[PDB]
Design a protein around this ligand. Sequence first.
Ligand SMILES: [Ca+2]
Ligand SMILES: [Ca+2]
Length: 316
Amino acid sequence: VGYPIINAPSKTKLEPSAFHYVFEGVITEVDEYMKEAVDHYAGQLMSLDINTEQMCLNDSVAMRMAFGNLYAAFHKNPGVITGSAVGCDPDLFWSKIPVLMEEKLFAFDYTGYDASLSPAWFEALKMVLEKIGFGDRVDYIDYLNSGTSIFNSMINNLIIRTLLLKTYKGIDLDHLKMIAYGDDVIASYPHEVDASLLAQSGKDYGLTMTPADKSATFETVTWENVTFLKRFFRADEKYPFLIHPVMPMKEIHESIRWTKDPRNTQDHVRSLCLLAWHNGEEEYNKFLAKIRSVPIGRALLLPEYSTLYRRWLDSF
Ligand SMILES: [Ca+2]
Ligand SMILES: [Ca+2]
């Protein structure tokens, strides 16, 4: 599985596609709170019994030698134990997320995540690695102070715990159920957590937190308005217990207007149809109708809705 929009390359490596005009495009050291956050998180990772062993086979691939098994673990176990979605199949994993979350959801975005991360956060990251067995290859982290999504997601787990602890004294982290993919995060708790208050705490650690998904105000987050990896959560009409990961056409329309080479348009458009069909038939067909309003589009293999839908059902 590849993430077309989320892992979209930079515009530097892109050129206009044949569909360019067919669519439009308009806090210094580790403190008492982090320490406890480490404690709680490291504990959870232990329940996984990740293999402390090195790996059995672009130079910086020595780190794939050091943390190869760690990465493999998160990849094999995306969820609330890892607190990571890195490596999930949105088509299947979306039906599980709701079942793994506590009743009250809370989310928010970061501004300049990677840039705003103080050195302390990395020290904390090391401590987590010490407690789960990789403490001898801890120096490999200074190379940031393949696995960026992993480590950044782990730092996000430390942040949320820390902020919760500093905002509400004595809170029990055992009831925190979150999932991260880099700096994007979906989270929950049995009681309403106010993200606007977490943000105030984030300031103390040099973090800039803002309402999620471009919002002027921190509003209540719900399954009807929450997004994860830019996708919404929409239950199927025939099987409500099956959740469609719904990427907005708006995001798709923009992506189809570019490409790396005209020789990948076929693959790239395939990717986009795999995301696109979840919006519903009427939507998908209009989408293909447009693609086919230009010569190259009419020469592309585009999967018809029903086959995609039926295949999806059978995938469960
Ligand atoms: Ca065990
Ligand atoms: Ca986000």
